[PDB]
Amino acid sequence: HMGSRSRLLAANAAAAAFYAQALQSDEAAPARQYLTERSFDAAAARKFGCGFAPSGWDSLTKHLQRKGFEFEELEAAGLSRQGRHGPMDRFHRRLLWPIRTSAGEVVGFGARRLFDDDAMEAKYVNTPETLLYKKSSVMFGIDLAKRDIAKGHQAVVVEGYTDVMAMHLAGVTTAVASCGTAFGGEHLAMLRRLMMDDSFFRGELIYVFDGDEAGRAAALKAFDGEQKLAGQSFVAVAPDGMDPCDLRLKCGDAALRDLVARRTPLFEFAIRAAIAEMDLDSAEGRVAALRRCVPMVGQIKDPTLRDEYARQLAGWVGWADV
Amino acid sequence: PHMGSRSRLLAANAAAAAFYAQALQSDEAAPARQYLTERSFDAAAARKFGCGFAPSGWDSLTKHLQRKGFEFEELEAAGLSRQGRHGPMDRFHRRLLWPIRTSAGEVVGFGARRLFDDDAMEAKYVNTPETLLYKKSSVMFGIDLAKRDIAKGHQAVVVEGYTDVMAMHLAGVTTAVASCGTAFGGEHLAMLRRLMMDDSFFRGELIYVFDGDEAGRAAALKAFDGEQKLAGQSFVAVAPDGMDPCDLRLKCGDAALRDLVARRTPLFEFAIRAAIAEMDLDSAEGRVAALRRCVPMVGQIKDPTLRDEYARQLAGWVGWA
DNA sequence: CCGG
């Protein structure tokens, strides 16, 4: 019993319920306000398991001790930690999102700052590295998205928790996000796995970015590795400044479906973005353009995909009929 | 053993290929050189694929290989020689040979084309029979060359003939392969599938290239059969006016072949539109009959996503219904 | 007094 995977999963399960309840308190008011300020209702908050870490030292810790859970289990789960005058909660006075497995089991939490006087000055904090929670492989929204990415042959990587919420609410049920860290290799590996039918990868990685420099960072990065999924990788970028949560407030739910639908392939975006910062209106800047982007084509390892982008260069700079 | 082993048999075929290659430069090998040069294959080409000529006579190669030390038991086992009444004799006579190899380049047999008018063998093409090395249902011409580019490019191009593979490779299509003697089956298909995975998780696009249309029909018919997993990744391309890839190169040059490949169609799309091509789209009552023939076909697609993408376009292909 |  003591400290098993199923025991820790039962603790995090108990903790999520407690935090979910705590969202309906008086001191939780600004946590609810954060949600409703960006158009998330009481239905939405319940759908994603949203909760409030209350004030005090050991609200949760005692709650789980009083329903059987020994402290040594709770520290290994990442819920509590050793304080000077005994045990205490990890999370305090913050809006929480339960981070689940694809099976739907809670392994940890993402917590946002609400109050100015909160000692923890970081904007977001997470459950630390545990047996269950692993930063580099865990994803928010994967429980809900699992079915529709396998069916849809499509994943939509977004930055934040509220960005996953806004996408899923707008119909884009394939949206997910990396929790407290950069999107990575074993995140990719996990999503790739679900999109397999037979022994064949099949689908679309759609990376949604906010701010165009953040998109251009992914662009210049696209040519780096073995370019394993590059052919099936795509970029969409919201109207300058915005993110999927904001886009849904200003321009409604349809604007997200279109943003996702009108994604650009990763290499195309990278190349054409470099052409965008050039003068295509003379013979000099036409040559300067090819002089920088033909090398980018040269780096493409798939000869099939390389030849496709070679064909479209003279079109994009201006030297031929598009 | 020492005599009649696998590596010994490969040595016999390797020798045989070297012998037949040399023989292509002979005087009586004029029409065999003519066959190649007539369809735009120069001396550089002929040496790449290892083209050769089987000489006139009875036991030309066999004697040459017996001088090299090979026993008759080995040469018969290799499918190079055979027992005639007054002694051993060659399998091939007075014919342009191409050696057929493994993916690692090891010669396992030959494909021979009829040249002369007074050839004893009536067949247009002859092959090495079933040996320890030569299995007709898994053997493919050009695989040694295409091996790499099929894996990296994630693309194979299946053509009908030897000259079609040659034409494709000279034209820059370095993913072209061909069946030898029999039609393209599952053991060929299942090998290229294995290959295009790239020792990994990759789906590659398999591109069939047909001369006429009965083949395109036969492939269109077979598109919907049983579990149809690799049918989704299969593609078809057909040359205009019923020409093979070799003659498409002769007349319309190397640019046609590369773009024939580029302008290939999905197998399902080809099959559906082939059926639409046999109906009167002029009247509005014809438009409706066409829609009615095709949603049964679209219905037979087992993948939901493909079906939806094919049911989408069905308006456009009917001429707006 | 070959083989196909």
Curated annotation (Swiss-Prot), chain A:
Record family assignment: Belongs to the DnaG primase family.
Q: Which reactions are catalysed by this chain?
A: ssDNA + n NTP = ssDNA/pppN(pN)n-1 hybrid + (n-1) diphosphate
Under what name is this protein listed? DNA primase
Keyword Chaperone attached: no
Q: What does UniProt say about this protein's domains?
A: Contains an N-terminal zinc-binding domain, a central core domain that contains the primase activity, and a C-terminal DnaB-binding domain.
| Originating species | Mycobacterium tuberculosis (strain ATCC 25618 / H37Rv)
- Record keywords, A-Z: DNA replication, DNA-binding, DNA-directed RNA polymerase, Magnesium, Metal-binding, Nucleotidyltransferase, Primosome, Transcription, Transferase, Zinc, Zinc-finger
Which residues of the parent chain are present? 112 to 431 of 639
User: What's the encoding gene here?
Assistant: dnaG
Q: What is the lineage of its organism?
A: Bacteria, Bacillati, Actinomycetota, Actinomycetes, Mycobacteriales
As a miscellaneous remark, the entry gives:
Was identified as a high-confidence drug target.
Gene Ontology biological process terms, A to Z: DNA replication, synthesis of primer
Q: Where does Mg(2+) 2 bind?
A: 210, 212
